[PDB]
Symmetry: C2
C-alpha cells in the first residue's frame, strides 16, 4: 500500500540524521585518521555466539538457551532449558543475562582449550552494551540491596563468598564435561543451588517481612519545592545528603524474598562470567549495530551505519580499512555495586583502564562493523584477520550459521512431552 505521505516523513527522519550528523564540526576530523587494515599474522581462535527461544504459556515463560563456539578446536556447546514466572520486562531480562552468562563461561572455557602461540576469543556483540545498562537494571541492584539489608552485611559477605566457591567448583565441572562430551546441559549454577542457600541464609532468619533500604536502591528526577522551602536555613549539601541518606521500609512475601535471592545469585553468577572471560588476553567483540544513546552520555561516538554513509558520500571511498577511536571508554561505577567489585578484579581492571573501540570494514564494498577489545586494536586486529575467508571471517560465520536456531528444538517437542507427562492444559495456552 503506497502511502506517498509517510515515506518522505520516514526519509526525512533518516536523512535528517545523516545530512545533519555531519555535526557542523565535520565528523570532528577523525575521518582522515582512517587506516588500512593491517597484516594478517597467525592465531588460534574461537568465535562464540548464542541463540534463544522463548515461549509464553500464560504466566510462565519456557525458554531454551544455546551457546556455541566454533574455531580451531572441536565444537563446544552450552545449553539450558528452563521456565520462569512472567514479568513483562524483568522476565526477558533474566533470560538475556543467562544467555550472556552462557557465552562468557563459554568464550573463557574455549580459550582455555585453545592451543597455539596466539590465542584469541571472538564475541558477537559489544562489551560496553552490557556494561552501561545491566539487563534487569533496576532489579539486580534492588534485589542485592534488599538482601544485604535482610540478612545483614556480614552474613551477606559469607553468602557471596560461599557462592563464588560454588562457582569455582562449577566451572571446573563444566570444563570436564566439555572435554569428555563437547556439550553441557546444566551451565547455570543458580537454579540448582538457590534452594539450599535459601534454607540456610534465609529460612532460619525470617518469620511467617519488613526491611529498610536506601532510597537509591531502585531516581525521581524532580522534587517538590516544598522540600526546599522546608529546608530553609540549611545548605543544598545538607539537603542532598538527607535525600541520599533517605531510607525506606518494604514488606516482603516468601515470594519476594525468594525472588530477591535468585536475582542476587543470578547477578553474581553473571558478573562472575564477565570477570572470567576478561582473562582472555586477546578478546574481541564484533557487532553491526549498538545503542549510542548512553555511550556519548557517560565520549562522542556515532553509529556504524551513519559512519559508512558519511564514508562513501563525503569522502568517496567505499573501501576496506578501519578507523581506531582515539579514546578508550571507562565503564560506569553506578552499574557495578561498591562491595562486589573487590571480588572480580578484571571488572576492576576494566573500570581502571578501559575498553578499546574501533570501526572496521573487512572488505571492499562490504559493510562496517564495530569492534571492541580489552587491549589495543593495533595488536588484536591482525589475529582476527588471519581467519578472514569471505565477506567476513570464517570462525564468526560458523557461529552464526551453527547456533542459527533450528526449527525450535522445544517447539511442539519439549512441549509435547510436557503434553504427555501430566497436563496438556498449560500447553494449550500458547
Amino acid at each position: 500500500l503506497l502511502s506517498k505521505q509517510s515515506i518522505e516523513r520516514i526519509t526525512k527522519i533518516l536523512l535528517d540524521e545523516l545530512e545533519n550528523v555531519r555535526e557542523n564540526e565535520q565528523i570532528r576530523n577523525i575521518i582522515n585518521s582512517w587506516k588500512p587494515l593491517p597484516s594478517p599474522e597467525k592465531s588460534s581462535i574461537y568465535a562464540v555466539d548464542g541463540s534463544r527461544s522463548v515461549s509464553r504459556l500464560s504466566g510462565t515463560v519456557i525458554y531454551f538457551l544455546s551457546a556455541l563456539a566454533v574455531g580451531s578446536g572441536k565444537q563446544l556447546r552450552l545449553s539450558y532449558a528452563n521456565a520462569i514466572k512472567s514479568n513483562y520486562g524483568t522476565s526477558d531480562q533474566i533470560v538475556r543475562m543467562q544467555m550472556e552468562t552462557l557465552e562468557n563461561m563459554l568464550g573463557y572455557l574455549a580459550y582455555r582449550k585453545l592451543e597455539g602461540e596466539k590465542r584469541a576469543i571472538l564475541m558477537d556483540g559489544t562489551l560496553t552494551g552490557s556494561l552501561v545498562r545491566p539487563p534487569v537494571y533496576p532489579e539486580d541492584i534492588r534485589s542485592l540491596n534488599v538482601m544485604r539489608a535482610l540478612i545483614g552485611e556480614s552474613d551477606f559477605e559469607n553468602l557471596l563468598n560461599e557462592f563464588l566457591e560454588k562457582l569455582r567448583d562449577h566451572y571446573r565441572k563444566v570444563e570436564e564435561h566439555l572435554e569428555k562430551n563437547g556439550n553441557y546441559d546444566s551451565p547455570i549454577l543458580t537454579d540448582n543451588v538457590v534452594e539450599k542457600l535459601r534454607k540456610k541464609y534465609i529460612d532460619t532468619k525470617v518469620i511467617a517481612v519488613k526491611v529498610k533500604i536506601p532510597r537509591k536502591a531502585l531516581s525521581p528526577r524532580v522534587i517538590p519545592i516544598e522540600v526546599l522551602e522546608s529546608s530553609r536555613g540549611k545548605s543544598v549539601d545538607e539537603l542532598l545528603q538527607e535525600l541520599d541518606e533517605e531510607k525506606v521500609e518494604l514488606y516482603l512475601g516468601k515470594d519476594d524474598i525468594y525472588d530477591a535471592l535468585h536475582m542476587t545469585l543470578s547477578y553474581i553468577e553473571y558478573l562472575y562470567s564477565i570477570d572470567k572471560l576478561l582473562e582472555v588476553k586477546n578478546l574481541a567483540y564484533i557487532a553491526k549495530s549498538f545503542y549510542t544513546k548512553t555511550l556519548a552520555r557517560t565520549v562522542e561516538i556515532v553509529d556504524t551505519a551513519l559512519l559508512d554513509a558519511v564514508i562513501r558520500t563525503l569522502i568517496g571511498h567505499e573501501k576496506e580499512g578501519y578507523l581506531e577511536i582515539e579514546h578508550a571508554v571507562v565503564p560506569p561505577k553506578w552499574s557495578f555495586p561498591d562491595f562486589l567489585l573487590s571480588k572480580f578484579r578484571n571488572i576492576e581492571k576494566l573500570i581502571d583502564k578501559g575498553i578499546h573501540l574501533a570501526y572496521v570494514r573487512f572488505e571492499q564494498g562490504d559493510v562496517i562493523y564495530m569492534l571492541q577489545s580489552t587491549t589495543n586494536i593495533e595488536k588484536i586486529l591482525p589475529l582476527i584477520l588471519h581467519h578472514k575467508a569471505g565477506g567476513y571471517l570464517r570462525p564468526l560465520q560458523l557461529a552464526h550459521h551453527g547456533v542459527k536456531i533450528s526449527y525450535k528444538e522445544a517447539r511442539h517437542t519439549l512441549e509435547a512431552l510436557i503434553n504427555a507427562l501430566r497436563n496438556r492444559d498449560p500447553a494449550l495456552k500458547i
Copy 2:
C-alpha cells in the same frame, strides 16, 4: 533434549499447579462456576492489531495495523513510521501507538454501529495496561520534566492545545473511514511535535555548547523542580537557591535531543490517554484474553486461566463451558495516571471511581478458558458477546485475528528498496 531438564521444568509447572490445587481461596469460588447466560441479540465490532518492527542500525522501522470486523463493514487503521533506538523506550512507544490505533478504531467502530444493543470486543485486558502501562517509569518522568522546564501555565497551554488538535484529528479520521473505511495517518503526535516543539520549547531555550541548551526555570498548581537544580548548586544555601528560583536566576543545561524526546513522549502519552478515554465512552465494552497473568497482576489484590483450567478438570473434572465471575471489581492504582492529567479525561476518571469487572469464561465444552474484563457487570455484557459465539469461540474476534495475521512483509522492499531512492543505500543492509 534432556530428561532431568524436562523433569525439572515439569516439576516447576506441577508445583505451580499443586499450589493452586491446594485450594486456599479457590475451594469456594470454583464451586461458584456457573452456566453461560442465555444470549442477547447485539451488533458488535471486535478490534485487534498487529505490528512489524525492523531495526536498521540505531533506527526502528515499524508498521501498525488495527482491524475491526463485525456487524458493520470492515474498518482499518495503518501507520508506518521510523523512530530512533532507545533500548526500553523504542519498543515501548511502538506498543503505545499500537494500543492507540486499537483504541480509536474501537471508539470509531462503535459510532458506525447500528443496533439496539451495541458492543465492542477488544483483544486484550483493561488491567494489563493499568497495572503496568506502556508508560513507567519513563513517560511520567518525561511529564514531570516537561512540566518543570516549560512550567505549569505554559504546560496547561500545550496540553489544552494538543487536546484540541486531537478532537479535530478524530473527526478527520472518522470521515476517511466513512468513505474508504481505512485511514493511513491515525497517529497525530509525530506530525504535530516539531510545531509544538518550536512554539513551546525553542521559545524558552538558548543554545549551548554541544547538543545542549540553557534553560531557565520558570515560576508559579503543584510546583515541581528538576532534581538537577539541587545537584548543580552545592556551594549555596537553600535560601540562596529559593531566592535565585524566584528571581528566575537558575539555569539548567540539558541535551537538546533529550528535551525533544521528553516532548515527544509527552504527546504520545497524552494521545494514548485520549484514546483510552474515548474508548471508555463505549457502553458495552469487553476485553478477551486467553492469557494475561503477570505475578504483579495477582499480588496487587486471582489465578491464571491456564492454572484454573488445569485445576478444574483436576479437582472437579468438569471441563464444562460456563463462567466464574470474580466477585469484587478491580480499581487501578492511581500511580498509573498523574493527577493533573485525569481532569482532562473524565471516562478514565470514572474508571478509577467505579472499577473493572472480571470473569473467567469458557465459551465451549473442551475449549480453553478466557479472561473477560468489562466496564459493566459480566451478567450484563456476557450475553451480548454470546450472541456471536461460533466455535469454542466468538466469530468476530476469530475474524479479527485471522484478518490481522494477514499482515504481509513487503516491509523490506517497501522502504528498503524505495529508501535507497532519495540518498543512502547503506542503512538498508544493516
